[PDB]
Design a protein around this ligand. Structure first.
Ligand code: MSS
Ligand code: MSS
Lengths: 365, 365
């Protein structure tokens, strides 16, 4: 219930403490300014957070760059000379909406993992050096490179096989132009809790791929065979083990949810709003419904457009009689991908994006 | 020197404490994410802050709306029912850059006021209700209304004359479509120190016009004859008193400044960056010089475009020999307005937008 000390600075009234590695943002804390307040942003760690000592000398933090023509270790100071890129993305856990999959379980069916609803997601602005700039300074990728492979900086238990625990992820090299090595989040030096001193940011991809405290970036011909790539974070059926032939949780699908009002309103005029994104694509439109998706209304976007990888705020002005309403939203991206009512089951419960399950029940009085 | 209780949450290391009413953002603290961190945003109050008990019931805060067909006092709760808007604006004090006017003084020429350099400015995201929507809900503005007149909510000392102390400002009614009554900034409820529970935000206008803790908004045929509107905050010549025939500090002029590197760097590639806006218009382009304005090069914009009232981060990658450089930026807006080298003198020291004076001395080692 209380905050662990690596996130003592965070807002405890805005957060569900699932565990010391896992804090969820309450649905009524998102705001309507697009950007998620740092002190309310969700936390999800696969392993323990490093000590705060790694932030003592942020410019001295080292990144080994390999799979390029002139491989070498670059400090953050050095990276700060190579370029500057700023971009807003949706950082969302692949598990976000796992609760809703658990709700579809029947008989002897079981699913482990955090029962996230909507709160394992936030829209933030990163600043740093683009990966293309880093790779191009070292003579470009080695011929045959197919993947960008990032390695988390956590000290591993000297005892176990490191491939069992290391947070290492591999994404296609097509993402080279979007990837950022970010030292800054929302205009501040990146907190330890969200991956300081440097984090590999992979736009449009799921949370897991945005490697906190990145110490190595390799352009590689093969994905990492680390457990967290090979077998974990794989889309499979109920009762299947994860394996590297199945899709990995890479691109994020088109998705939205209602954020306000979360619970209660007076009868009359009500502003219904929430967040909507297309993952790799921009959100083009959101339809909103107050009767559980029986009747639909086009909503309008709110605030500026922060790019194809960020979310938009939407809103519908409703005039509601006294009753108990069922608020849902259905986003559509620029390529025509639209949220289904329910998301097809998968055993680990990754990538929920159905519109029915996250419905908000609104008592209008 | 220390921080007063009402801004004890702010980052002491990021702020120069001119007084208990006046805190300036250090030039090294702007970041490159566009948005200015809440805890680093500048503070500037003409009179004392209200007690924080006014935030105890934010939704019960009352705003009298007059100069419309159906004049009425609305609570914030009610305002939340009438619409939703979100926008990024540059919040800048009309005093920002006064030190640079004070440097142009010769002989017996004095100038009072805070010697701000570049840190009485921030770019933030406001969320709230559009004033148009509030005004439409109450039948529209009265026939012949020519101004929006906002009254700050500070308790006035009894005995004294209200008009000598009240923070009340008028802007032309042409701003109706842009004006927001904001309960939220950067995704959080608005802090007391930045005008919570409700602030009248006037995009593209100098800071004084953005009325904190707004308790009345009136569509008026004349400007308020309050002191702060009538004589204060007027562009007049060195030696003159202020008077209402003269231009008020309304629309912000085209402007930019370098924010990084602030002091030092190493020989070789150096990423020079800053912020740039057109006030009422977007920034179209920015040129940067390393030799005090002898040679210019086109910079490129960094991060998303947050709209016409916000600022763009810009950057220029330059390759530098060891030496002492003089970093300047010159911004152009969408209608062809460029920054001048120096700004024409005015007695109060308002509206400096010159490129020579805010120059950064870079020691490239
Ligand atoms: N280094 C590292 N990184 C990393 C990790 C760990 O553990 N480690 N986790 C993941 C995940 S998985 Mo699921 O797909 S979600 C997620 C994310 C989150 O983030 P924040 O905490 O910042 O929010 O992160 C990411 N990264
Ligand atoms: N109510 C009120 N409001 C108000 C005031 C006062 O005093 N009061 N001030 C002004 C000014 S002036 Mo010169 O032009 S700048 C400015 C601004 C600032 O804000 P922040 O503090 O938030 O930053 O505010 C504005 N508003």
């Amino acid at each position: 219930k209380p905050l662990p000390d690596y996130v003592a600075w965070k807002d405890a009234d805005a957060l569900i403490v699932h565990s010391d590695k896992t804090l969820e943002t309450k649905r009524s804390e998102f705001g309507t300014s697009i950007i998620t307040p740092e002190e309310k942003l969700y936390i999800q760690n696969n392993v323990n957070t490093p000590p705060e000592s790694i932030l003592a000398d942020r410019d001295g933090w080292k990144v080994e760059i390999s799979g390029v023509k002139e491989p070498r270790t670059l400090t953050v100071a050095e990276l700060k000379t190579l370029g500057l890129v700023t971009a807003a993305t949706v950082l969302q856990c692949s598990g976000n909406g796992r609760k809703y999959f658990k709700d579809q379980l029947t008989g002897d069916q079981k699913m482990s993992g955090t029962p996230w609803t909507v709160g394992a997601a936030g829209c933030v602005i990163w600043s740093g050096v683009p990966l293309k700039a880093v790779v191009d300074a070292l003579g470009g990728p080695a011929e045959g490179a197919r993947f960008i492979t990032g390695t988390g900086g956590e000290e591993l238990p000297a005892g176990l096989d490191p491939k069992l625990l290391v947070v290492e992820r591999s994404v296609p090299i097509s993402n080279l132009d979007n990837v950022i090595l970010a030292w800054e989040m929302n205009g501040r030096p990146l907190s330890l809790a969200h991956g300081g001193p440097l984090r590999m940011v992979v736009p449009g991809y799921s949370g897991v791929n945005n490697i906190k405290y990145v110490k190595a970036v390799a352009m590689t011909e093969v994905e990492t065979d680390a457990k967290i790539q090979k077998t974990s974070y794989r889309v499979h059926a109920l009762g299947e083990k994860g394996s590297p032939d199945q899709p990995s949780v890479w691109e994020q699908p088109v998705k939205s949810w209602i954020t306000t009002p979360h619970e209660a309103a007076k009868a009359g005029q009500v502003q219904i709003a929430g967040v909507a994104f297309g993952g790799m694509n921009a959100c083009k439109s959101v339809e909103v419904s107050v009767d559980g998706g029986q009747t639909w209304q086009e909503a309008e976007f709110i605030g500026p457009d922060l790019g194809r990888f960020a979310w938009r705020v939407f809103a519908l002005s409703a005039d509601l009689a006294r009753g108990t309403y069922t608020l849902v939203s259905r986003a559509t991206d620029t390529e025509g991908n639209v949220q289904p009512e329910e998301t097809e089951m998968n055993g680990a419960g990754y990538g929920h994006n159905g519109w029915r399950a996250p419905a908000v029940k609104l008592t209008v009085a």
